Chains A and B, each alone.
Chain A
Amino acid sequence: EHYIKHPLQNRWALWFFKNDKSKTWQANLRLISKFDTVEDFWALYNHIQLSSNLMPGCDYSLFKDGIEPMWEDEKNKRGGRWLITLNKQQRRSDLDRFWLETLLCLIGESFDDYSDDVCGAVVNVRAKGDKIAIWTTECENRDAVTHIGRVYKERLGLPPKIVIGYQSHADTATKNRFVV
C-alpha cells in the first residue's frame, strides 16, 4: 500500500541555470534529472541545494518532459507566466516554502481541467529580489490561464488584497494580460 510507487501524471525534468559568464544563456542551462513518481520527486528534492541557498543569478526550472525551460520552445512561445516577485531575506528563507509549494501544484496536477496548459515553473534567485513563476502554453486561453491563476494564489496562501499578474512571453520579450 506504500511499497508500490505512486506515479505522477507527467514526467518532469528539473533544470538548473548557473549564471557563469561563459557560454550563451541557453548554455549554463542544464538538465539535472527526470522523475515520474512522488517518491522519486522527493529523493531528488531532498538532495539538491535549496533555492534559498543558491547564489545570485541562478535558476531552477521544473518543466514537463519534452518542454525546454525557454520562451522559444514550441509549448512556451504562445504562452506566458504567472509572476510573483519576492523580497530578498537575510533570514526567514521563505523563498523555499513558495517554490516547494509551486512544485507541489505542478506534480500533483492541482489545476484540474487545465493542468495540461501548464508547461512548468521557474524560480530565479537574483540580487534584487527573487521570482517564482508558473509558465502555461497559451496566453490566449483565458479560462485556463485564469483558473491556474486563482488556484495558485490560493495555494500560495495569498490574501484577497494582494493580486498577481500574468504576462505573455512575447510581451516580456519585447503589463499583465490577466490579474487574479
Chain B
Amino acid sequence: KQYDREFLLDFQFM
C-alpha cells in the first residue's frame, strides 16, 4: 500500500 503525495494531501481537510 503506497500513496502519492497529491493523494495524501487530498485528505488533509475533508
Contact = CB atoms under 8 A, between A and B. Distances in A.
A111 B11 CA distance: 21
A112 B11 contact: no
Interface in A10-61: 38-39, 41-42, 45-46
Size category, A interface: 20 to 34
Interface in B1-14: 1-5, 7-9, 11-14
A7 to B, nearest CB: 6
Interface stretch (A66-74, A78-86, A101-109, A118-126): A101-109
A108 B12 contact: no
Contacts, number: 38
A108 B2 contact: yes
A9 interface: yes
Contact of A46 (B1, B4, B7, B12): B12
A16 to B, nearest CB: 21
A155 B11 contact: no
Contacts of A7: 1
Contacts of A107: 3, 8
B3 to A, nearest CB: 4
A177 interface: no
